């Protein structure tokens, strides 16, 4: 209902510990209209290299919004209104495998949705769409993220299955044994779904750069929120280097089409 | 979330007894995406004179949707997606005054909102808008409707205050005495608000052509739904003539000030 | 979805201070299925004279449910499932006129609805109904209540307009001046609407026996909930006498029809 | 709240590609009252052989309603109001196993519910019911469908586990590996639950005739909505023959044990 | 569920144009737990004179929240958790009378609630409370605000009836004529209710200092949001002097009694 | 919003068949305020040994509330307002293994959450909390329950994984094979989650004493509600002895701290 005059081709959704992306030189905060209400915070917009970039911290100012209350539809709609084509999510995840260590990055290629109470789509009728998500993340952006990590010599696992749980509580030992031994998941978090599905419906090329912040229930002391924030803080510098490099590497234009998903 | 390639500059919203406007030569029914879900029915789009017109029966097929359940936001959003600039509403109303006659048309110029359970705006945050509605209807469209009625010699009152109630029940005698003797309203219905509000927020030029179908509680036998449908049916031919003539009379382009409404 | 085996032709809905109607000899409490969930409490069913009567306290056990949270649709649906034809509501009201004194009964004949956001109907589509409520209460039951009061020599005003407010707060002085000097209301409460409209939609013959429990904002000391309960308690005996007598006076069968209200 | 005069003993719920069942000789469309609002479309009622049959397309006209927004409670309630005893569901499913072929029918005998956002029951209190669903489908109807397929020589698998997902997106590869390799499910869809749950609560004898329309993520090119519609269309003729024959084969009367399910 | 260690005895709720109260010398922003979710923004807490004061802008950062979406329950709950006893609201209002001029302050003593879509109470059951609000504002705080304005020689009307409308649209001319001539209202706004209700239920002593920012529909050019912000900006300095002086004038302790409101 | 004068250090939440705990010598029923509305019933408070104990039947009077509609947040909030530190849940569960026999008690040590439609937390923002629940039950309370069962020679399994399903329907055979063979669950119920979550967020020490009432789908006749009630009734006396003994064995004070869970 409002003409959006600001434009950005790349959107960055920051997770825990990344309220300030540390990637902008000059920027401003803007309010973006959505028919779903409030995005998590105002959108920070500014130029990086030759790119206009939009940033939104999914938990908002002061990490005031828990995963189950994030307005995922408003956040993705706001980025679409700005003309965003590429969406880079940076998240904190727990590792379900001894091989994915604290501070390691992971560029997942699959996910399993264990969420419960969310709004999963922009298409509630009369235009019905069933998007394919066999390979849920954008391959070209995943490949560019992997190349950037290799170029910067930042330790990064090139694949992984992300299991998304509802939260806000962390998993019981029985649940985590199920996630690992059975669902064959590698990392765990609470925010990927429905963000990734909505981005696909919005015809964006979305990928996640996850950083392992804890070993879930598997280390001598199980995961606590304090641990997650502390570990993410120790690794913000590397995350910002990776992001800054990846953003300049992206080509102009890259789920690209809804035609075969529309009934 | 999907590109709407169908286009219409004029939108007609049909009320009771007007499921088929009888104004189209060639037409088709389309599904229009909205972030609010389902409009009342598929929209009928077709050309009249040199105008592309979109028609929507607000109660849907078979008059299946009561006033309090109409998805007013989806209906106005759908028309906006089609590029509609002029919205003509045709409605059935009760007369609260005895000098009017059944079958007379009224082009109201004011309203009093007594609704209770509705969603009144497209602006829920973060972009706050407070539209001015001191003169709630579009003056240019009201004037063209009045000129059309004069040209066709169709008895029409050129002003009036519409009191919109919640429904679905009709008013008690005590409420109607208040509406007429204290508020000084002229006509009464259940569907004007929030339709008019939303059209204004969408920067459309909206006007209502109301048809007196009953005398509310004031005749020997009080209003019933059966009476409303019966009287509306006796006057549909005149309504269709008025509607057909008005549509061709409209200029290409005409609440066009969201700028001063935005905080 | 449940076959309701128990039957009652008369339903009593008790308001403030009437958890125990004091009218049954033998009775039992039953759970009644409704598609709207929970009625205010289990329904007490038993015989009085030659009639099967069902009783339900609208605020539930311990007056645990405030007016704005009462499940009016479940309460009326439960009585319909039992075969109830006559519904007698007993309520506590404030007086807006010096002539309607504490302890006086009032059999209202009109109402004005000032409630906000309650659920007003059983007809949300696809079967649309617009019931006529010009004379909102059942005339035959009002007349029998008046005759019973006259026979018992219980002081009772034979007409009156009930203004129903949302609550739970009581009115400001400016609001009460408006209800009286303007809307011409006589008594005030918080529970009549939507109970009366739902009963009409369910084709029952509904009437209210109201008892004045306070003078709203007009006495030197404005109304408090403590006053309402105290005054109601001082007049329970008279209320029970009136109820017991009216119940036996009712003929077998008496809004009687929905035909002309169905679009 | 209104008397339903129309009656049918058999109800058909059509899925994707089955808006027109092609089984009626003479029929009409009716609006059926429900306390849950709108069924997916007006019901089509007509006689076939010696029986009255009711048909409802679960996605509505133009496939306007996605799985997660279908009013399952209104659809089943409407069929119950009509007196339906047998409910035959025709649905499109993906095969999770490669030994099945596109176009094969499957008469499942079990399901696994992975839905997330739905209303699962008609019993929300005060009448609590916990239906048994160990064998979720009606055995007598499944057996009659299997006999019909054998008599018509239509290739049909006589058992199978249906995993019902939330949608509207299709599954990721990691999710589908879990559904097949771990859960051992055979077919997958989005509409079975809570339709089957509700039909059991309504004491109906429900069974699904599923049509394999894709191989989910397992063929060279993963499932798309376009493929589902295309394959369904190629096999509608056979589905109509099976339906027509089954309907005439059913006895007058056959989950009719609500007694032991009521706490 | 959280122990709140921060404390303030005075709370200031700032309205339009008052995001920065300009009264703190040293302060910090805190997050306050509420069972209703998010207050409008973090609460600014700091010392002024010998008082600890808490400030909350009701529209949030960047005036991102419209009146109909403000979480009034969370805002008042947060102030109660901090130990607030006095609540001073500063608001922008339209004048319905030509002698209450632009920039004049008004200390209303009554209100009329015309809101429609809000949550009005903290008491939804099982503890039922009906607060008595005949004189809705705290007399002692009103009297101190009036004394302060007199001492500073700031033009202020010492009484007035505030009519609260739902918004976000402004009133039609017919509604405004009704508010003035019929309801006898003096000023109009959108945010007083339920804020005042809830403060009374929380046993706080609440008063409003209103600033006339427009003449509603009565000047040659009707009210616009642009005008409201402009006039408010022209008078912020005076509002800050009034506020600063009143805050220091308040006694340590003063609706301070729910006992008689409890059923 | 009101001061709770009543105090209890131990809370007992009773499940199916335990409306009357048979543990009190003298007690009374009280209404406890919560910002979430209605707890399942009035809270029974009384003395046992040297302790004040609060009891709440989670299904309410007459087992009127099914698992999916229980107001878990109001029940745990009410116990917190009373000062409860220890919470003992007594529940009915199905056994997924043939060596956990009818009437055997189980003190689970883990759970798997398969619920779908519930409110899982007290922390919806702005104070975000992610409680750790690797070992979801209070170890000290579990150990005391186990010691009590040993002292009374009541057959009890000292560990076990509880899988919580949504209900109200019972599981299909395919789902149950999955819970056992795939998730490695031992017992199954519908009420543990979110009760346990919320108790941990409220910093209470919570444990479940489960009673095997059926073999789910694994016996010759699958579980029915009638069986669950019958088996629970056959073992009520034993459950009451365990409960009475455990209550007196508890020390004054024991999820102890939220500090590390707060972001
Ligand atoms: C700041 S602590 C909470 C955040 O941690 C992320 N997270 C990190 N480790 C885990 C884990 N082991 N399980 C689930 N979410 C996790 C979640 O997405 C949530 O937003
Ligand atoms: C078909 S009967 C119901 C319709 O009648 C219109 N209507 C006609 N007369 C009246 C009246 N007297 N009061 C309220 N609505 C009326 C309403 O807008 C509603 O959609
Ligand atoms: C027990 S105190 C609250 C009850 O008092 C009734 N009531 C009595 N007097 C008044 C009054 N003056 N205004 C509104 N409701 C009133 C209302 O319907 C409410 O259920
Ligand atoms: C018309 S495409 C969408 C429909 O496909 C059905 N469907 C077909 N194949 C699959 C599949 N592989 N996974 C999930 N649903 C499927 C679903 O029930 C949905 O209503
Ligand atoms: C900033 S423009 C919107 C604000 O103006 C206040 N307001 C000012 N003048 C008026 C008026 N004439 N009618 C209603 N609200 C008004 C309202 O409370 C709303 O938050
Ligand atoms: C009185 S029958 C319903 C209750 O049975 C408990 N229950 C007992 N056995 C089972 C089972 N096999 N599966 C699920 N819930 C069960 C549930 O928690 C529900 O509240």
PDB file of C-alpha atoms and ligand atoms in Angstrom, chain A residues 15-17 58-59 63 65-67 70 91-96 162-163 165 168-171 176 188-192 211 213-217 223-226 228-229, chain F residues 128 130 261 263, ligand 1:
ATOM      1  CA  UNK A  15      20.893 -14.079  14.032  1.00  0.00           C
ATOM      2  CA  UNK A  16      22.120 -14.337  17.594  1.00  0.00           C
ATOM      3  CA  UNK A  17      25.017 -12.087  18.442  1.00  0.00           C
ATOM      4  CA  UNK A  58      15.781 -11.316  13.137  1.00  0.00           C
ATOM      5  CA  UNK A  59      15.615 -11.095  16.955  1.00  0.00           C
ATOM      6  CA  UNK A  63      17.450  -9.716  21.117  1.00  0.00           C
ATOM      7  CA  UNK A  65      12.091 -11.498  19.932  1.00  0.00           C
ATOM      8  CA  UNK A  66      12.291 -15.280  20.474  1.00  0.00           C
ATOM      9  CA  UNK A  67      12.217 -17.677  17.474  1.00  0.00           C
ATOM     10  CA  UNK A  70       9.487 -13.747  14.868  1.00  0.00           C
ATOM     11  CA  UNK A  91      22.856 -18.079  12.368  1.00  0.00           C
ATOM     12  CA  UNK A  92      23.976 -19.724  15.569  1.00  0.00           C
ATOM     13  CA  UNK A  93      23.521 -23.493  15.683  1.00  0.00           C
ATOM     14  CA  UNK A  94      24.243 -26.395  17.938  1.00  0.00           C
ATOM     15  CA  UNK A  95      26.343 -29.294  16.649  1.00  0.00           C
ATOM     16  CA  UNK A  96      24.991 -32.858  16.885  1.00  0.00           C
ATOM     17  CA  UNK A 162      19.846 -28.465   9.823  1.00  0.00           C
ATOM     18  CA  UNK A 163      17.025 -29.687  12.104  1.00  0.00           C
ATOM     19  CA  UNK A 165      12.985 -27.101  16.393  1.00  0.00           C
ATOM     20  CA  UNK A 168      12.269 -21.782  23.076  1.00  0.00           C
ATOM     21  CA  UNK A 169      13.454 -24.635  25.244  1.00  0.00           C
ATOM     22  CA  UNK A 170      16.465 -26.614  24.102  1.00  0.00           C
ATOM     23  CA  UNK A 171      16.112 -30.337  23.336  1.00  0.00           C
ATOM     24  CA  UNK A 176      18.715 -35.099  20.550  1.00  0.00           C
ATOM     25  CA  UNK A 188      20.279 -27.671  15.157  1.00  0.00           C
ATOM     26  CA  UNK A 189      18.569 -24.334  15.488  1.00  0.00           C
ATOM     27  CA  UNK A 190      15.213 -22.624  15.908  1.00  0.00           C
ATOM     28  CA  UNK A 191      14.959 -20.016  13.153  1.00  0.00           C
ATOM     29  CA  UNK A 192      15.514 -21.484   9.733  1.00  0.00           C
ATOM     30  CA  UNK A 211      28.269 -21.048  13.073  1.00  0.00           C
ATOM     31  CA  UNK A 213      28.084 -22.241  19.076  1.00  0.00           C
ATOM     32  CA  UNK A 214      27.594 -25.316  21.224  1.00  0.00           C
ATOM     33  CA  UNK A 215      27.453 -29.121  21.230  1.00  0.00           C
ATOM     34  CA  UNK A 216      23.781 -29.332  22.163  1.00  0.00           C
ATOM     35  CA  UNK A 217      23.341 -32.044  24.870  1.00  0.00           C
ATOM     36  CA  UNK A 223      24.010 -26.129  25.934  1.00  0.00           C
ATOM     37  CA  UNK A 224      22.808 -22.970  27.691  1.00  0.00           C
ATOM     38  CA  UNK A 225      21.844 -19.618  26.150  1.00  0.00           C
ATOM     39  CA  UNK A 226      24.843 -18.050  27.890  1.00  0.00           C
ATOM     40  CA  UNK A 228      25.613 -19.632  22.694  1.00  0.00           C
ATOM     41  CA  UNK A 229      26.039 -15.882  23.108  1.00  0.00           C
TER      42      UNK A 229
ATOM     43  CA  UNK F 128      14.009 -14.093  25.867  1.00  0.00           C
ATOM     44  CA  UNK F 130      15.861 -20.696  26.361  1.00  0.00           C
ATOM     45  CA  UNK F 261      18.866 -19.305  30.041  1.00  0.00           C
ATOM     46  CA  UNK F 263      19.769 -14.155  26.409  1.00  0.00           C
TER      47      UNK F 263
HETATM   48  C1  LIG G   1      20.946 -17.171  21.931  1.00  0.00           C
HETATM   49  S1  LIG G   1      20.462 -18.799  22.576  1.00  0.00           S
HETATM   50  C2  LIG G   1      19.043 -19.243  21.486  1.00  0.00           C
HETATM   51  C3  LIG G   1      19.348 -19.336  19.996  1.00  0.00           C
HETATM   52  O1  LIG G   1      20.267 -20.409  19.811  1.00  0.00           O
HETATM   53  C4  LIG G   1      20.179 -21.084  18.483  1.00  0.00           C
HETATM   54  N1  LIG G   1      20.739 -22.408  18.906  1.00  0.00           N
HETATM   55  C5  LIG G   1      22.055 -22.566  19.223  1.00  0.00           C
HETATM   56  N2  LIG G   1      22.359 -23.743  19.635  1.00  0.00           N
HETATM   57  C6  LIG G   1      21.167 -24.434  19.604  1.00  0.00           C
HETATM   58  C7  LIG G   1      20.787 -25.755  19.966  1.00  0.00           C
HETATM   59  N3  LIG G   1      21.639 -26.650  20.474  1.00  0.00           N
HETATM   60  N4  LIG G   1      19.462 -26.110  19.778  1.00  0.00           N
HETATM   61  C8  LIG G   1      18.590 -25.217  19.275  1.00  0.00           C
HETATM   62  N5  LIG G   1      18.829 -23.937  18.926  1.00  0.00           N
HETATM   63  C9  LIG G   1      20.155 -23.626  19.123  1.00  0.00           C
HETATM   64  C10 LIG G   1      18.645 -20.941  18.276  1.00  0.00           C
HETATM   65  O2  LIG G   1      18.350 -20.786  16.866  1.00  0.00           O
HETATM   66  C11 LIG G   1      18.127 -19.722  19.182  1.00  0.00           C
HETATM   67  O3  LIG G   1      17.695 -18.559  18.359  1.00  0.00           O
END
